[PDB]
Amino acid sequence: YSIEKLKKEENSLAKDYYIYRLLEKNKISKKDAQDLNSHIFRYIGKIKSELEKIIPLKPYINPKYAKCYTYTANTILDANLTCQSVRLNSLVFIASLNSKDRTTLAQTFKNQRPDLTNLLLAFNTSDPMSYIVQKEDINGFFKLYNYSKKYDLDLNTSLVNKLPNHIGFKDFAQNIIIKKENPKFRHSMLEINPENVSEDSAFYLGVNALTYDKTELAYDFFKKAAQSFKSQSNKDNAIFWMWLIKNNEEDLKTLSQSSSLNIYSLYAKELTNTPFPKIESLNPSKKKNNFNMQDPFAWQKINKQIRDANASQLDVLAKEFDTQETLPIYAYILERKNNFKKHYFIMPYYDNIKDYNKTRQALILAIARQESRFIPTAISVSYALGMMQFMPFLANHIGEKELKIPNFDQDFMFKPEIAYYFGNYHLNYLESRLKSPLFVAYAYNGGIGFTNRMLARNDMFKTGKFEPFLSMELVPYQESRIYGKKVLANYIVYRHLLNDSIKISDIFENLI
Template identity: 55%
Template sequence: MLKKSLIVFILSVIFADCAPYSYKELEKKPNSLAKDYYLYRLLEVNKIKKNDIKTLKGHIYRYAGRIKTAIEAIIPPLGYNKEYELCYKFNAQNILDANLTCQLVRLNSLTFVQDLNSSTKELIKKNIPSENAKISKLLDAFDSKDPLNYVISNYDSSNFYRIYEFDNNQKDFFLEKEFLNELALEKEFTNFIKEIIIKKKNPLMRKSLVNIDANLTHQDNAFYLGINAILENNDTKAFDFFKVAKNTFQSQNLIDNATFWLYQLSKDEQYLEELSQSNSLNIYSLYAKELKQQPIHKIEILNPQKEKNDFNMKDPFAWQELSKKINNTPKKDLAKMAKEFYTKENIAIYAYIQERVEGFSKNYFIMPYFSYLKDYDVKRQAMILALARQESRFIPTAISTSYALGLMQFIPFLANHIGNQELQIKNFDQDMLFDPKIAYQFANHHLDYLESKLNSPVFVAYAYNGGIGFTTRMLKRDDMFKDGKYEPFLSMELVPYAESRNYAKKVLANYVVYLHLLNDNTPISKFFENLIQNTDSQNKSLAAN
């Protein structure tokens, strides 16, 4: 215990003495997520002058999310394209005085279109060239009492999605098959159906989706139309959609997901056998291996003898530069690059490169920095490894687009709360999360909290990714993770937050494999059984949150 306290004290002194990068220092750094993160840190404490902020965009790698919000709080955006600035002097009363270019610019706003009177709409339509027929139809729709009903009645698939999103009431309609088949060809179709299926909105629309021609669908939209057909008690049509999804998906993981549903619907052993032979170790192939009484295999064992190379594993900028180089290097040259990192300290980078060399066809379940986990029980060791593999691929200086940090990808707010208030580390700085020992310590501490509230590694994964509030709200619903046909697999496809939905599946697969590697052969079926929330103790636990 004394040794642990001494290490934390030394680290806190080291980090406390490290002044943040100055703006002048960051100006010289290549644009990257690491640079964005440190610029954002300066913005948080008002260390960038307003005059410098005006030219800051040229130094930003990804102008979105936190850094965009911070900059726009200081210098509000124009709210329109400066190229067409003069067009915005025209309103619904004088739009006829504008040239065609400005008229088309203003018609991009449905609020503006809604404010036009009928005669103005008619006069504008006369000037619209034939290649902009979509806009003429839009004006016709807004000249009716109910624009959404108008586009549905007139099979105007080109304007349906915009008007549906604009309509505050988002009224429910049963859509005819012919119109649905047209809607399926529009680029907005996939997001539209996922929204109404996962959130269980618009019951009439969802019911009508079953009638879409499966041959007009592909990949994600075919898959979620299959889920919808199950919810609508039409397993035959669901099978058709999943078959299309299986045949059009590119990723083996997604192919296995669709194959699993084909097995669930048909109980055809051919699909189960196919899953059991998959090269991808995901929850569906692992379950198939269990049902077919086949061992988990094809895990790559790495045992480098060299301690390290000269790459700085503690420098976030070094990783950003190397990551860019990896992405820009032809696959034939990557294998040579990988060999440079076949060392004990750099094994995460070696595995990262090899996955790309081999097109993710091999399974690397490495355990870097395992000495920091040796005092934990096997299940906790496996859970931390499972999360780290999914969060960062064990890259200690990884930074996400939301500025989650390090091996375990803690967001700064949570990192500071744990470091300052819960663990009370003296002179804590969030960059301490780039140290693997600290990252594992924080993960262990946070898992103590999550596991006190949630009874499954899957639910813990949802909470680790999407937050405890999101997870408990979902589990309190009467239509999620309850006993029923195709459960818990159906609920796992309907988790409202897409990132958490996919994340937890991958973490569970990682968890089962790491348990196996640590000589705990708990079958994956045990974790599926534990997802059904029926017992009084489970309900009491949720009610307390």
């Protein structure tokens, strides 16, 4: 596809992918590049670094404050008050000022902007965080945290209980707890009243409490999360923790009866001799329809229709895509049409994997379900490709260097045969070194590098009261933490459907 044919397609990640491929082959001239960010659906990361090597975008400072950005630290006292206040939005600018000028400006702004006064006079001390904490300036606290993570201080009960009301709190709490940073901040957050937090924040404050062996506090935080969380899957995770900590059989019972299929509800069902959840059976009789499952532009279009459709239109689309050839689209539509209440675990292009053993089949299918929902031309924001969502680098390494395939192109990852084949190959590499399917899952999403480093630590996937469940909450990247939980449920399910059951309790034992 030339840049001309692409310009005639709707903006989408598919079209971004293809523009990025031209850019990486140096086929975009400085003239082609003029109109080009109007042709880019998501102007972020690699495609933007690459376009900026050709046309280094100058903007953006706002026409209204242009004059304000002509001053420096040495001339800011000659700026009008509006300009003084705008420039003082940057803590780096504040840190750059000399101390006499911070004193002057602190007085100028006392009455009208005490927030600026506080930051100014704080940077006149050897510890700005300590000054801000003493004023209980909550906006200033978060501005300082975002300027530098290195500040760490004990916070009293009054202060920590004010932090949850600021939008910054959730990412702050998660980040320092998951990363095991800012120990004084962490310890201080034991005194947050569960009444003052909810959802993810409450959940992470329970994980925090467990790391200090404050099991009562933890229960209280987990219970608040269970009550406040929107998603049933997240409630179940919280209810599991309530059960593990205080051992109330009504918690486990409630969890065994969840409509969400996840590792926590699966596990609770197995502990209470409850039958395995019902898995829908999708068996369309029509073989084919018009739709090209190998056209990535067709997918991007129909996906947008599906996601924007009223209850009525979903039904017209359900009927149209009720074919074997478009089975992954059928399932995708049915998932949105039943408001995410039924369990779909399809097995498309099955011929390509039926000769592998059943455990490997289940892992492949588990990964595919999470990566793409089996959409052959799926493209991520990082331009990972096909059902098994291969990064192009790896796809080219395997296809050209290892398997010496004639005329290999990375777009071969859009072929099911190739996606499953490469997925098998890469899963052998990972499972050979890692063994557990949970660990394989982590390494598949976030690299074997990061997985090996996490498993090398003496406080991750070792023996303990609350292991391996606690470790699964402390996986340092949120995306990988979530990916692994989901892939593991998928694996259990597919093993079951393939008559190769395994007890999830055995999986958990093999994590220690």
